[PDB]
Write an enzyme that holds these catalytic residues in place. Structure first.
Site, PDB file in Angstrom:
ATOM      1  N   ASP C 145       0.860  -1.168   0.000  1.00  0.00           N
ATOM      2  CA  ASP C 145       0.000   0.000   0.000  1.00  0.00           C
ATOM      3  C   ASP C 145       0.898   1.219   0.000  1.00  0.00           C
ATOM      4  O   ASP C 145       2.119   1.083   0.009  1.00  0.00           O
ATOM      5  CB  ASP C 145      -0.919  -0.005   1.216  1.00  0.00           C
ATOM      6  CG  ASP C 145      -0.131   0.075   2.506  1.00  0.00           C
ATOM      7  OD1 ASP C 145       0.819   0.816   2.534  1.00  0.00           O
ATOM      8  OD2 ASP C 145      -0.455  -0.604   3.452  1.00  0.00           O
ATOM      9  N   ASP C 147       0.878   3.828   2.311  1.00  0.00           N
ATOM     10  CA  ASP C 147       0.794   4.561   3.568  1.00  0.00           C
ATOM     11  C   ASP C 147       2.122   4.533   4.314  1.00  0.00           C
ATOM     12  O   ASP C 147       2.148   4.649   5.537  1.00  0.00           O
ATOM     13  CB  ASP C 147      -0.301   3.998   4.474  1.00  0.00           C
ATOM     14  CG  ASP C 147      -0.016   2.595   4.983  1.00  0.00           C
ATOM     15  OD1 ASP C 147       1.080   2.122   4.800  1.00  0.00           O
ATOM     16  OD2 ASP C 147      -0.901   2.000   5.549  1.00  0.00           O
ATOM     17  N   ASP C 149       4.851   2.261   3.155  1.00  0.00           N
ATOM     18  CA  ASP C 149       5.547   0.997   2.934  1.00  0.00           C
ATOM     19  C   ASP C 149       6.913   1.201   2.307  1.00  0.00           C
ATOM     20  O   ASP C 149       7.112   2.125   1.520  1.00  0.00           O
ATOM     21  CB  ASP C 149       4.741   0.061   2.036  1.00  0.00           C
ATOM     22  CG  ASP C 149       3.530  -0.531   2.717  1.00  0.00           C
ATOM     23  OD1 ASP C 149       3.210  -0.106   3.799  1.00  0.00           O
ATOM     24  OD2 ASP C 149       2.952  -1.437   2.169  1.00  0.00           O
TER      25      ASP C 149
HETATM   26 MG   LIG Z   1       1.319   0.150   4.506  1.00  0.00          MG
END
Ligand SMILES: [Mg+2]
Ligand SMILES: [Zn+2]
Ligand SMILES: [Zn+2]
Ligand SMILES: [Zn+2]
Lengths: 98, 39, 783, 244, 168, 270, 81, 111, 146, 65
Positions: C145, C147, C149
């Site tokens: 994702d 967010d 990573d």
């Molecule tokens: Mg993430």
RNA sequence: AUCGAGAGG
């Protein structure tokens, strides 16, 4: 009809980080927990004399703003006095795809 | 900073008796989750 | 385990990832600072010395530069300490540790690595800024994702390893996963949602809008398609323009619930020769489903074309969506007056039913259910009522949402969201639960100090009447928090547990491999499976097909498979064949027809024994149905004309194909017998699919088309056979270990006929793999 | 991240000229994906925004205190009274073409927090560098120019891929490599490699002839020596005597 | 419980039948009960179905239960992978666990066995028993940097004398 | 596009506002004009700060950042050499404007440092640029920072020429209102509603300048976008009418430059 | 044995990968190329051309479980895939 | 860290001419033109005017990636109408209309 | 232009905008040919319809370009914008759609049906017993007079 | 910490309104909303720049260096 | 260099 005591105010069951969440009771539980962790990660003015004290790693926002929507608990946590974020204008929409 | 000052490290579920005494939402993610509670 | 089995390595990079819809499926955006840092020892030859000498001149300060130069003597020239950038003359045989260039093959992954899909090779694209850029659709296998990573790069040094990755680990080659016999990549998030909206019946596109959309398609042949509407205005349908992305020759037909090839719902799906024909395109079509477009294209056109399909569709749809827009807000969670009134009536009614039962239980009228106590019988029945109430309330809200509803649209598209999400936001959140029970009496005879003792009224034990829109009341809030807590706990524990399990399986099966004898063995050479998978074929090349002869009445079977040239009851209609009037009464052909039918009868007997449940849909190599369709289109099979097929040729042609399938190639009867058994189902499929009536009435192919089909089946079949050297051990271990991480059921939430108090999810998996002598739930089924 | 446990990163930035705009000329500071809502059910996130707009327009502070009598209907009523769509949707135009967007956009003020964790202090890449003196294996730590750990799971996947030569490269060529002489008689690392006179001599076996060179990871050498330290031999033979 | 039964027409028709789901397992006696079809009785215990019917029945049941676990959440794993797992666990004529008392208790290369859980506890035994590791496994070649058999290393690229001539 | 197009009508006007009705134009041009006004008009602004003395609370670059956002008179910006094209080393009066700031807490009370306190040092050569824009009725142009008695601030600034694409500090547009098809006749948008969109959506103020659509009307599919309602503001560095005129000039120059490029290639072609 | 080779006549994806890799390496080491370099400078692309034309001078020794093996030449193997 | 220079949004670099005209092979009388250091602020005007020319069969553009200020323009015309000249005509047309825009505004402003 | 595959007149029995804002499902029946019914999805927003309306419906196959017969420019070769509407063109109808074909469904031999589809908008024509002119070739131009 | 020169979303200079803003609240005693309106802050994207501003600099100047 | 703590994924 046998009440002995009465809560001063339901919202007081929340702690520090939880109490700065808007309408907590309109979120799915885990999300309030996730925010509790996120609050600790935010940048902003920590101590007013931060300029005086020498320390390792300080993260001061150039222009800290009040939460346009607040909770009454912030009156005691002095969040308005030392906020940690900004009132950005947002659009919830699919755009360029980024 | 306040989250440390009200921090209570237990040495892990939200027990009914926690009502009003410790915060339901505040807890670390994984590992110590449910053990470290805030007032 | 610390320094040997795993270790820190050089020529690697790590940073944050971000989405980038303008990259091709198999590309990766690498920051200039990383491209500058990491190097590659390219050898100086007569075919690249021109470029390499330029790179030396560029120095180590350009993202198309170079660093250390290696002489034949082994000397390393550090260009950071050199004033000879334009003086050093490279000699053939030297090496130049150049910066990473575009199209270099690099290995890219995400931790934790649970399966092959987490490690794939990408083509480098040097970009500005400092994040790794990925094509949305590749995040599905990485389980990534955006967010925060982070991903790792591993850069190849030898030419051998570059080739190895580009030919084995390349992203396109991993489109269809051998794990679940399906695609592991597909269209998600915005593009998926956008497609649904794009292909709606009411979606028409203006001329100049079309001109841009067509230009976006990289593979557009420069031919503007005639508009669906030509008079009042030259308009193109969304289906028309989207179909430009899809390659020619592609055929697909799903056919949904109420599909009639004319349904006003525009459900189902029909694609002919790369042209979208009918049905709204959604998750089921362009998702990871093995019955959808992504799978078919991969199989028909191959990995390379399919990779382009991803790029084509995304560029078109994202552009269209950009100039359309899609949002969501509070209004989407708000049901109208009447609806909310019905919701509160539904809740109140359920509460009344719970109350009625409560009174009966208190009155000692309630009778205990078999196999359980009275007290828990009460508990069970009450929970049931409240769960049904929640769902009914949810349906009331759902039904009364307009198609305008943005949340509804995401749910309909299949891109984030579901029924329960709508139900909880707009209607009753529902009964909260801890360890599969209602909120327990943590206080003496009560759940909170706000309730009197001995009170089982729904809300007192966690039932939430309000929606997220309406807001939870203090008690409901806390009870909800309790349920949320155990959820959070389980998400932590399960990673510790499945992490361990996954490792154990991989280690246990670490050395299981398919040898050149087509036999699965371990290090000791011990035979695990004489024929890999009991068939010898690669899961990646397997498709679910229908064994027509298993089902149907015996009469129906006879009608569809019995041919009798001696009796009018089953004699073929002369017009089917150019010489159909000559075969009439031909006993010699009847003998072949009797042979065929007899075998088909035997096939029913056999398959009825093998699949006693009557299931006809099974995973078999080579989608013959699709092959036939290709022939029908490729050779323009005019179904009004008599064919030049001969019954003898059909019977013997199919038999010949069976003989030439192969899997094992030994001469010993042991191997020959194994060969006969190895392809039994596939041959059953061939015989059931290519019967005389099937070939002459249903699939009225010409001799040329028919012969083509047979030779095509042969080629594809051979391609489906597993290659020797295949690590089926580790592969199977990962295939089983990976998806286990989705088991959040533990012991309940799966339903059944009897009182299903049966250990499941991960807990059960542990019992199985450990071979526990004392399982929590024994249970013996007696018929 | 917002105040509702909604994290995220900046995928890309655009100049005002390229971003959606309202009829009033207001251009978003941050655009959020619609798909981030329905599955998380952060309704409060949406409510905060609606309320916030009313607060900005009315010029006062909004009250988002948990258990109060403030409802969405009350908030939306106030918003409509300011001349805006009651549910917070506004007609916006495409910044690229200026054409009115087909769908209206939920649009308003909210509160985001800049969190610690920045790509500038995470990005890391190294090609050759400081190695641990113990195992001669790249050090640990971004700040120390360390390498990245190719873990057990990572090598497991290469096996599943069949990338045999890649593993050889990453496990030996990319760190840990040592040429050592092995005595042909006893497979131990006791050869006195006099690499200047080409003299060897096992000593104890008196083998000055039948020895071989092995290219092996330094860490593996340590393993074998540490086994020798416990009076255990690990005799490395280059000729498989056990045929089958 | 419902079950499709090939009707007199030849087509499967779903029929209902009474099934007794009991709590606990005791095949040794239940199978002999009059009025019961001893060939359809099914348990959840691998050990008991094995001991009563045999290793092939045990292995078959083992598969079925592995299947049930995966299928219980709606997911799908190819038969081929699940079959391999349960086949490996039953190659010894019993039920071999995936633990250090299952996998590690094998005759495979010492340098591989020790990579799982127990380490010196295995290496000490290898030393004392003078165990010879054939080095043709995976870990055996990982732990010393050689191109382990498998994939591109499962064969040897070379030019022989015949082909050398043919390649000139 | 052949001159007989853009019919400019002004509804309202002030020092920092021009309320337009631009009819008989191509939507693409209406938008292009909007965009070019937003980010392709050259202005003057502080793009370099020398900190000599700073004993104030605020960080050196914190202040420098603020200074760069102060609007400077840019009326004759076209007479100032664009710094990238200035062959003269570092900078000079022909391509830059030098301003200085000197403040000291003479009073025991908080001393305010204002943009009005900036002093131009370099030779303007008669060009109307550099003067801090002051639109404060009190004369106190933009508050730079506050200052305690014992503190001192001494800065030297160099203002240069640039456009918003380089940095938002260069923009003069401020905000531009833009709307067309008041009444949804072209059906360029599909109103979201939970009951009645005609009542749920607020009627735009621009609706009073166009006749309402009738329910008996058929969709006029032949109709094109036209008549654009705009309201251009200004930050004060450039007279709002000049913001618009210069935006238009910019587009002409842009098209002319690619036209020139086409000509240049044709000249280079055989 | 020369005849009676029981292994497939087709080239596997693993064999193909290593053949191209090892040949490309030789090419990058300035080995003689047996096909026309039609603007080709990338060792791998060059090797793939040779593979297509069966000009790659290699033999695959396929080891069998018991230590025995079958030698197959690149030309003999059917490069389908 | 590794952020790009904002000058690269509009200033031509070394070896970067403003325009580059390539010929298409997918269709007759069709070209693809690359605009360097130039986004669709200008690009959208060009397409719009090209589509007002009845001798133009195709006119469309795309920005392949937002990290770079580049603009692809594809033009197809009828036989004899050299697309290059079609573009030249579109430019002349746009300028003429802009001239009137300016004049009308200045007059309206003065009044 | 050069030919016609079908030509008849239908009366609309029903109009159904099944949750659509532009396209309606038209159920019409042929006048005279009572064996021929017509189902049709049509962009009503663009071309208004009503129940009991009598429409003239044809199919044809002449690629309706500009000059005398089926000129490739419409099917195979890039579609050219209008302008040439001032040349030989079957443009005297009030609505034109270019479509394709599915299958010649044969219904109860004496009964009749034919292939259909217009870029997503579907139809169903029970065309006369013959339909000999009505070839499978996907080229088709549903022409409708108001 | 002093008022942002220019609105983040517009560029509209609001750095010269703070002083008079406070006067509207103190000397005139107006509702913050009406005060913002008196400043010409029509758009809510500019109103928020003042409405939620936190003047910390006054606290910083309480220290003696 | 070990050792614990705080986090991130
Ligand atoms: Mg993430
Ligand atoms: Zn020795
Ligand atoms: Zn100068
Ligand atoms: Zn603003």
């Amino acid at each position: 009809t046998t009440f002995t005591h009465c809560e001063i105010h339901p919202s007081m069951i929340l702690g520090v980080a939880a109490s700065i969440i808007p309408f907590p009771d309109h979120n799915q539980s885990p999300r309030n927990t996730y925010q509790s962790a996120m609050g600790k990660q935010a940048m902003g003015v920590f101590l007013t004399n931060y300029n005086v004290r020498m320390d390792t790693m300080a993260n001061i926002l150039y222009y800290p703003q009040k939460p346009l929507g607040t909770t009454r608990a912030m009156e005691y946590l002095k969040f308005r006095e030392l906020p940690a974020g900004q009132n950005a204008i947002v659009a919830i929409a699919c755009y360029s795809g980024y | 900073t306040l989250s440390h000052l009200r921090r209570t490290n237990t040495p892990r579920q939200l027990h009914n008796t926690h009502w009003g005494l410790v915060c339901p939402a505040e807890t670390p993610e994984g590992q110590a989750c449910g053990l470290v509670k805030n007032l | 385990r610390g320094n040997l089995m795993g270790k820190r390595v050089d020529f690697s990079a790590r940073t944050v990832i971000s989405g980038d819809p303008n990259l091709e499926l198999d590309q990766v955006g690498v920051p200039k600072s990383i491209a500058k840092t990491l190097t590659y020892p390219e050898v100086v030859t007569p075919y690249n010395i021109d470029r390499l000498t330029q790179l030396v001149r560029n120095g180590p300060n350009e993202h198309p530069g170079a660093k250390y130069v290696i002489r034949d003597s082994g000397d390393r020239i550090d260009l950071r300490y050199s004033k000879r950038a334009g003086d050093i003359q490279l000699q053939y045989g030297w090496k130049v540790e150049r910066h990473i260039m575009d199209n270099d093959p690099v290995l890219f992954n995400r931790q934790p690595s649970l399966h092959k899909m987490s490690m794939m090779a990408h083509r480098v694209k040097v970009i500005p800024y400092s994040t790794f850029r990925l094509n949305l659709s590749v995040t599905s296998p990485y389980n990534a994702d955006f967010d925060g990573d982070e991903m790792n790069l591993h850069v190849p040094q030898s030419e051998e390893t570059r080739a190895e990755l580009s030919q084995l680990c390349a992203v396109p080659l991993q489109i269809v996963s051998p794990q679940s016999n399906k695609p592991c990549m597909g269209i998600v998030q915005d593009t998926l949602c956008g497609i649904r909206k794009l292909t709606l019946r009411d979606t028409f596109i203006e001329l100049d809008q079309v001109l841009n959309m067509l230009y976006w398609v990289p593979d557009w042949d420069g031919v503007i398609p005639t508009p669906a509407i030509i008079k009042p205005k030259p308009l193109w349908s969304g289906k028309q323009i989207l179909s430009v992305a899809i390659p020619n020759g592609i055929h697909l037909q799903r056919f949904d619930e109420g599909t009639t090839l004319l349904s006003p719902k525009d459900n189902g799906m029909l694609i002919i020769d790369g042209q979208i024909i009918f049905g709204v395109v959604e998750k089921k079509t362009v998702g990871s489903s093995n019955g959808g477009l992504i799978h078919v294209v991969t199989r028909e056109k191959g990995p390379q074309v399919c990779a382009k399909l991803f790029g084509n569709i995304q560029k078109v749809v994202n552009f269209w969506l950009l100039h359309n827009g899609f949002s969501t807000g509070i209004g989407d969670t708000i049901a109208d007056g009447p609806t909310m009134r019905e919701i509160t009536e539904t809740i109140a009614e359920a509460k009344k039913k719970v109350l009625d039962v409560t009174k009966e239980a208190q009155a000692n009228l309630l009778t205990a259910k078999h196999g359980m106590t009275l007290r828990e019988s009460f508990e069970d029945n009450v929970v049931r009522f409240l769960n049904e109430a929640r769902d009914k309330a949810g349906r009331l809200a759902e039904v009364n949402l307009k198609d305008l509803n943005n949340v509804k649209q995401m749910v309909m598209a299949g891109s984030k969201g579901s029924f329960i999400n709508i139900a909880q936001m707009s209607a009753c959140v529902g009964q909260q639960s801890v360890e599969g029970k209602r909120i327990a009496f943590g206080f003496v005879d009560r759940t909170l100090p706000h309730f009197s003792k001995d009170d089982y009224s729904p809300e007192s034990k966690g039932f939430v009447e309000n929606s997220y829109l309406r807001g939870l009341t203090p008690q409901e809030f806390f009870f909800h928090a309790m349920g949320g807590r155990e959820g959070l706990i389980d998400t932590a524990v399960k990673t510790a547990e499945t992490g361990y399990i996954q490792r154990r399986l991989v280690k246990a099966l670490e050395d299981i491999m398919v040898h050149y004898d087509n036999t699965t063995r371990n290090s000791l050479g011990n035979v695990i499976q004489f024929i890999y998978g009991e068939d010898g074929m690669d899961a990646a090349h397997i498709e679910k097909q229908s064994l027509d002869t298993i089902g149907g009445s015996d009469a129906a079977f006879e009608k569809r498979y019995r041919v009798d040239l001696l009796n009018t009851d089953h004699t073929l209609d002369p017009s089917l064949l150019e010489s159909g009037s000559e075969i009439l009464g031909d006993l010699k052909l009847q003998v072949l027809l009797d042979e065929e039918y007899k075998q088909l009868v035997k096939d029913r007997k056999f398959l009825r024994e093998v699949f006693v449940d009557g299931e006809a849909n099974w995973p078999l190599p080579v989608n013959i149905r699709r092959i036939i369709q290709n022939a029908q289109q490729t050779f323009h099979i005019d179904h009004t004309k008599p064919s030049d097929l001969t019954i003898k040729d059909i019977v013997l042609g199919v038999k010949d194909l069976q003989e030439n399938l192969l899997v094992l190639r030994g001469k010993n009867e042991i191997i020959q017998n194994a060969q006969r058994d190895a392809v039994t189902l596939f041959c059953c499929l061939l015989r059931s699919r290519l019967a005389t009536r099937r070939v002459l009435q249903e699939y009225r192919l010409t001799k040329q088309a028919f012969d083509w089909v047979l030779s095509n089946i042969e080629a594809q079949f051979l391609r489906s056979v597993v290659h020797p050297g295949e690590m089926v051990g580790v592969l199977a271990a990962q295939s089983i270990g990976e998806p286990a991480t989705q088991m959040t059921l533990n012991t309940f939430h799966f339903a059944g006929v009897a009182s299903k108090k049966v250990t499941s999810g991960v807990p059960r998996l542990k019992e199985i793999l450990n071979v526990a002598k004392n399982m929590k739930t024994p249970s013996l089924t007696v018929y | 991240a917002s105040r509702h446990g909604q994290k995220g990163t900046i995928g890309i930035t655009y100049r005002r000229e390229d971003m959606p705009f309202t009829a009033e000329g207001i251009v978003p500071d941050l655009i959020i994906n619609p798909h981030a809502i329905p599955s998380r059910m952060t309704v409060a996130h949406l409510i905060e925004c609606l309320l916030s707009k009313v607060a900005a327009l009315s010029g006062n502070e909004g009250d988002a205190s948990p258990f109060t009598d403030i409802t969405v209907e009350g908030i939306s009523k106030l918003l409509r009274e300011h001349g805006y769509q009651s549910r917070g949707f506004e007609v916006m135009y495409n910044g690229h073409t200026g054409k009115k967007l087909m769908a209206q956009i939920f649009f308003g003020p909210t509160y985001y927090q800049r969190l610690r964790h920045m790509v500038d202090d995470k990005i890391h890449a190294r090609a050759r560098g400081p190695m641990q003196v113990l195992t001669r294996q790249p050090v640990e730590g971004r700040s120390r120019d360390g390498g990245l750990r190719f873990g057990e799971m990572e090598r497991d996947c290469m096996i599943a891929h069949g990338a045999a030569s890649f593993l050889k490269e990453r496990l030996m060529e990319a760190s840990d490599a040592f040429r050592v002489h092995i005595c042909g008689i006893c497979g131990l690392m006791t050869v006195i490699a006099k690499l200047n006179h080409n003299q060897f001599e096992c000593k104890g076996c008196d083998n000055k002839i039948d020895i071989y060179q092995i290219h092996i990871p330094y860490a593996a050498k340590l393993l074998f020596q540490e086994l020798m330290a416990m009076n255990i031999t690990p005799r490395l033979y280059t000729d498989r005597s056990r045929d089958f | 419980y419902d079950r499709k039964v090939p009707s007199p027409t030849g087509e499967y028709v779903k029929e209902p039948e009474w099934v007794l789901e009991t709590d606990g397992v005791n095949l040794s006696e239940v199978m002999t009960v009059p009025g019961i079809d001893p060939t359809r009785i099914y348990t959840n215990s691998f050990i008991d179905i094995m001991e009563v019917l045999g290793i092939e029945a045990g292995r078959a049941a083992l598969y079925k239960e592995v299947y049930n676990v995966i299928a219980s959440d709606g997911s799908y794993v190819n038969y081929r992978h699940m079959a391999l797992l349960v086949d490996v666990m039953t190659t010894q004529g019993g039920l071999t666990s995936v633990t250090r008392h299952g996998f590690n208790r094998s005759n495979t290369g010492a340098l591989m066995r020790c990579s799982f859980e127990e380490t010196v506890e295995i290496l000490f035994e290898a030393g004392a028993s003078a165990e010879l590791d054939d080095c043709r496994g995976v870990s055996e070649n990982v732990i010393l940097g050689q191109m382990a058999p498998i994939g591109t290393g499962a064969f040897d690229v070379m030019i022989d004398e015949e082909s050398l001539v043919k390649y000139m | 596009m052949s001159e007989e197009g853009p019919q400019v009508k002004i509804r309202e006007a002030s020092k920092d506002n021009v309320d337009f009705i631009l009819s008989n134009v191509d939507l693409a041009m209406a938008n292009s004009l909007r965009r070019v006004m937003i980010a392709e008009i050259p202005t003057l602004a502080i793009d370099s700060v020398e900190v000599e003395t700073n004993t104030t609370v605020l960080a050196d670059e914190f202040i420098a950042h603020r200074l760069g956002l102060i609007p400077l008179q840019s009326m004759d910006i076209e007479q100032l050499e664009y710094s990238r094209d200035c062959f003269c080393e570092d900078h000079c009066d022909k391509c830059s404007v030098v301003l200085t700031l000197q403040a000291f807490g003479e009073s025991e009370s908080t001393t305010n440092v204002y943009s009005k306190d900036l002093v131009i040092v370099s030779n303007l050569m008669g060009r109307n640029i550099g003067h801090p824009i002051i639109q404060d009725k009190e004369g106190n142009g933009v508050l730079i920072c506050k200052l305690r008695k014992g503190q001192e601030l001494k800065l030297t600034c160099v203002a240069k020429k640039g456009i918003a694409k380089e940095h938002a500090k260069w923009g003069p547009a401020a905000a531009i209102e833009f709307e067309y098809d008041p009444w949804n006749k072209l059906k360029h948008t599909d109103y979201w509603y939970e009951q009645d969109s005609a009542k749920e959506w607020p009627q735009s103020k621009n609706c009073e300048y166009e006749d309402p659509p009738n329910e008996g009307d058929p969709f006029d599919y032949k109709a094109q976008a036209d008549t654009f309602y705009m309201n251009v503001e200004s930050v004060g560095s450039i007279p709002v009418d000049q913001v618009v005129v210069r935006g238009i000039d910019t587009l002409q120059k842009k098209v002319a430059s690619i036209l020139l490029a086409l000509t240049q290639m044709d000249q280079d072609k055989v | 044995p020369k005849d009676q080779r029981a292994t497939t006549p087709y080239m596997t994806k693993y064999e193909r990968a290593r053949i191209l890799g090892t040949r490309a390496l030789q090419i990058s080491m300035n080995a003689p190329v047996f096909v026309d370099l039609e603007g080709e400078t990338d060792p791998l692309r060059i090797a793939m051309k040779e593979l297509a034309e069966k000009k790659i001078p290699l033999v695959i020794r396929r080891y069998l479980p018991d230590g025995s093996f079958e030698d197959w030449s690149v030309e003999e193997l059917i490069v389908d895939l | 860290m590794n952020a790009p220079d904002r000058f690269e949004l509009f200033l031509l670099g070394e070896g970067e001419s403003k325009l580059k005209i390539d010929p298409d092979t997918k269709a007759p009388n069709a070209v693809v033109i690359t605009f360097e250091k130039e986004d669709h602020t200008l690009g959208n005007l060009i397409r719009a005017e090209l589509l007002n020319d009845r001798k133009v069969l195709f006119a469309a553009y795309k920005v392949e990636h937002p990290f770079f200020a580049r603009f692809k323009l594809r033009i197809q015309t009828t036989e004899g109408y050299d697309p290059k000249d079609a573009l030249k005509n579109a430019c002349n047309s746009i300028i003429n209309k802009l001239g009137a825009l300016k004049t009308n505004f200045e007059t309206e402003w003065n009044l | 232009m050069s030919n016609t595959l079908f030509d008849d007149i239908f009366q609309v029995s029903e109009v159904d905008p099944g949750r659509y804002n532009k396209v309606c499902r038209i159920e019409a029946a042929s006048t005279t040919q009572d064996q021929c019914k017509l189902t049709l999805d049509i962009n009503v927003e663009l071309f208004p319809v009503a129940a009991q309306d009598s429409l003239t419906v044809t199919i044809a196959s002449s690629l309706n370009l500009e000059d005398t017969p089926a000129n490739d420019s419409s099917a195979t070769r890039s579609w050219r914008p209008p302008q040439a509407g001032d040349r030989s063109l079957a443009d005297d109808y009030d609505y034109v759609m270019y479509g394709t074909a599915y299958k010649f469904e044969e219904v109860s031999k004496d009964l009749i049906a034919v292939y259909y589809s217009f870029g997503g908008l579907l139809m169903r024509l029970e065309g006369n017993y013959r339909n000999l002119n009505n070839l499978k070739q996907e080229n088709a131009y549903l022409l409708i007079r108001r | 910490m002093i008022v942002p020169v220019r609105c983040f979303s517009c560029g509209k200079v609001v750095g010269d309104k703070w002083e008079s803003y406070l006067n509207l609240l103190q000397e005139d005693e107006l509702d913050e909303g009406t005060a913002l309106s008196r400043l010409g802050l029509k758009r809510y994207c500019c109103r928020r720049m003042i409405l939620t501003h936190v003047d910390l600099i006054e606290k910083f100047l309480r220290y003696n260096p």
